[PDB]
Write a protein that binds this ligand. Structure first.
Ligand SMILES: CP(=O)(O)N[C@@H](CCCNC(=N)N)C(=O)O
Ligand SMILES: CP(=O)(O)N[C@@H](CCCNC(=N)N)C(=O)O
Ligand SMILES: [Zn+2]
Ligand SMILES: [Zn+2]
Ligand SMILES: [Zn+2]
Ligand SMILES: [Zn+2]
Lengths: 403, 403
């Protein structure tokens, strides 16, 4: 067997919020088999990995990434590349994401099953990357945020998964699952980077969303809904959607429903900084930069409000909108908008794994879980920005980065 | 500018076949700007790369690879993977190929523009790999070696580029070029790994092949033809095809025509060793292993004969049939079947670049060419197997591998 014995100054238990001193974490064939103390016995063959002075955390989880997109290629600039360019560069993005300490991610919309292919390649050992929960292709209403909206009718550009009835949406779920979707991503409202809508406009009916949820849940998979507008958020929650992405303009009623039903919010409150700084240079049209400004501050204020009200938060950044590998920059923003460092860390570890239905496998350094860990200098309970520069990353017992 | 100053014990001039002692090769922004002597002046900023005791050669060229295929996944085993799995793993194969010292390769048939995407990603700097000349999708006759041949009619599996008239073949060339083909690959005869044919069976008419060549040549691109059978080889050469792949059962008349017209032969004489050892384990059906045995030794004997007769040889291995990264194993086989080490080396450097129409850019360590080089221990003019374990690889001035 392949055995690593990892020691450090401290380990953060993300469930209890307490530090454990002088941990010795044994990982056997990719799974944590022991969390003891430095100086404890190790099995024969164990390879020592010693990290003096630093603090171990679980591998981090980003619930909202687009690995086959590039922040710097916005707007029509993307048209210059072949289709398979994206299928290839996602490999580099996966590598950057893992090296930043993000050992599990949820890809919530990619082109032509790119993310399914990437998952298969990583899982089989051909290329390095996070454990990817793959949504495959995201969909919603014809003409909506998940459709192609930047072209005239002569070009007849449309998402083949456009769904305009509950039964068509059900069929989309079935087709996506058939070809590798492990979670379903739908567009319940308009958005920032699409054309011909506003974020507040609901785009799927309650009935349409309910059919998606009912079908996904029969197969034991979850549903994530893109939703900025208040009514889209409320109705998605009511329909049983598992996670609400963005959740930017949520109202009191939506917050209350989310608490009642146990829906998670996945709020990408960092990336507006990047968009406003670099979007124009990157090819984003003015109308879209405008919509981003319309929702940026409100989303942050609503994160604070929803957090205070008890809505379960997961860490979702929309990597791809901003550069892959910068995924940890959002922790600080969550703290600025009300979270303790512990809550912010929990959103990308304990709570994220719960929202994935993968608590047995990821999200904590505990016996039975995958040997996915990072180490950071300093005191992450006191300063969450320490997560921006991990000194150590391990995934499935493999050392990705180390001092 | 990015400047490297590379010194070594010797440099092999592949044009003259002579060693140059104590070379100092300066590479500026990826291009060789000087080949002087160790101890010579260097421009300000130059980074020293010193390789004592070893011999520099040009970066090696493999004229026949399939980067989005895997040797170990043969037969129906490939069906278990998603389409984009292949689009991703080609990244790993590209990396292994570069690390083996192969800095330029010609991909002669890939799925759904995989190779075009890979080329774009490498060239833009996202992932490491060789300079890839991309054939995109290979094609020939309906039911032929380039078609899908392992499925019943109910499944209606067919290569969309199947061409059954000169004008349809011309259209295929035009469509392939439109979407990134830099060279055209056609199937002129049956083959080993397809079903329902024998290698000796010609599958495109002279007229069909002539139309392909005429069209490709108008656009200034070349044509490579898969051809085992004698008549397919003769007629492809007569039609003006630039390189003949495999060329396994060439006859006297085909050899004479190839010399007369200046056609190159690209003979993959190594891989039968791998196929006979591992093919069955890898999922290759018995009928195909049989066809491989039918052509293996004859191809080698005909390489010797064609080489002696003066046919211009290029280095083409069919990586993908055997493991990517093992590309240098064929040199020894060429020497066993008549080549001098120099001729074998020339086939993967000087002659290959000429067959690519890229003599100004690759194939030699000379001013103006890309800074693509390897270094090997020992005396490659005396023992070509030294190329199997290069100690140094550089591509576009970037150090890929070094002592
Ligand atoms: C593909 P996507 O739905 O994640 N893109 C979002 C990005 C939201 C961007 N902005 C803020 N969080 N402020 C949108 O176009 O609505
Ligand atoms: C995709 P492909 O045409 O390179 N495959 C060849 C492999 C030839 C294999 N054998 C020998 N060189 N003996 C074929 O199926 O005919
Ligand atoms: Zn969204
Ligand atoms: Zn998104
Ligand atoms: Zn062939
Ligand atoms: Zn081939």
């Amino acid at each position: 067997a392949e055995i690593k014995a990892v020691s450090a100054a401290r380990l953060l238990d993300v469930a209890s919020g307490k530090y454990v001193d002088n941990p010795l974490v044994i990982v056997t064939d990719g799974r944590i088999t022991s969390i003891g103390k430095k100086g404890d016995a190790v099995p024969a063959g164990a390879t020592a990995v010693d990290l003096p002075g630093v603090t171990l955390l679980p591998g981090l989880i980003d619930m909202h990434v687009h690995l086959d997109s590039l922040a710097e290629v916005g707007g029509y600039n993307s048209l210059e590349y072949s289709d398979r360019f994206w299928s290839v560069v996602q490999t580099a993005n996966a590598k950057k994401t893992l090296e930043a300490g993000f050992t599990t991610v949820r890809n919530v919309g990619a082109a032509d099953y790119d993310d399914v292919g990437l998952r298969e390649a990583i899982d089989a050992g051909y290329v390095p990357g996070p454990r990817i929960v793959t949504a495959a292709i995201s969909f919603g209403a014809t003409g909506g945020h998940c459709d192609s909206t930047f072209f005239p009718p002569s070009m007849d550009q449309k998402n083949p998964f456009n769904s305009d009835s509950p039964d068509e949406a059900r069929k989309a779920v079935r087709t996506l699952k058939k070809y590798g979707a492990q979670v379903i991503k739908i567009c319940a409202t308009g958005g920032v980077f699409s054309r011909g809508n506003e974020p507040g406009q609901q785009q799927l009916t309650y009935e349409e969303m309910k059919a998606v949820v009912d079908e996904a849940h029969m197969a034991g998979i979850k549903v994530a809904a893109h939703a900025h507008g208040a009514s889209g958020i409320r109705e998605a929650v009511r329909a049983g959607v598992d996670t609400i992405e963005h959740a930017s303009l949520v109202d009191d009623e939506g917050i209350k429903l989310a608490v009642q039903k146990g829906a998670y919010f996945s709020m990408d409150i960092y990336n507006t900084d990047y968009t406003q700084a670099e979007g124009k240079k990157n090819g984003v049209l003015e109308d879209n930069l405008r919509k981003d400004r319309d929702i940026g501050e409100l989303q942050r204020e609503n994160f604070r409000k929803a957090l205070k009200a008890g809505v379960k938060m997961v860490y979702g950044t929309d990597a791809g909108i901003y550069p892959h590998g910068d995924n940890a920059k959002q922790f600080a923003v969550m703290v600025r908008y009300g979270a303790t460092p512990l809550q912010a860390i929990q959103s990308a570890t304990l709570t994220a794994a719960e929202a994935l239905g993968r608590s047995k496998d990821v999200g904590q350094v505990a016996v039975g879980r995958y040997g996915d860990m990072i180490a950071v200098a300093g005191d992450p309970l006191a300063d969450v920005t320490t997560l921006e520069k991990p000194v150590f990353v391990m995934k499935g017992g493999a050392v990705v980065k180390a001092p």
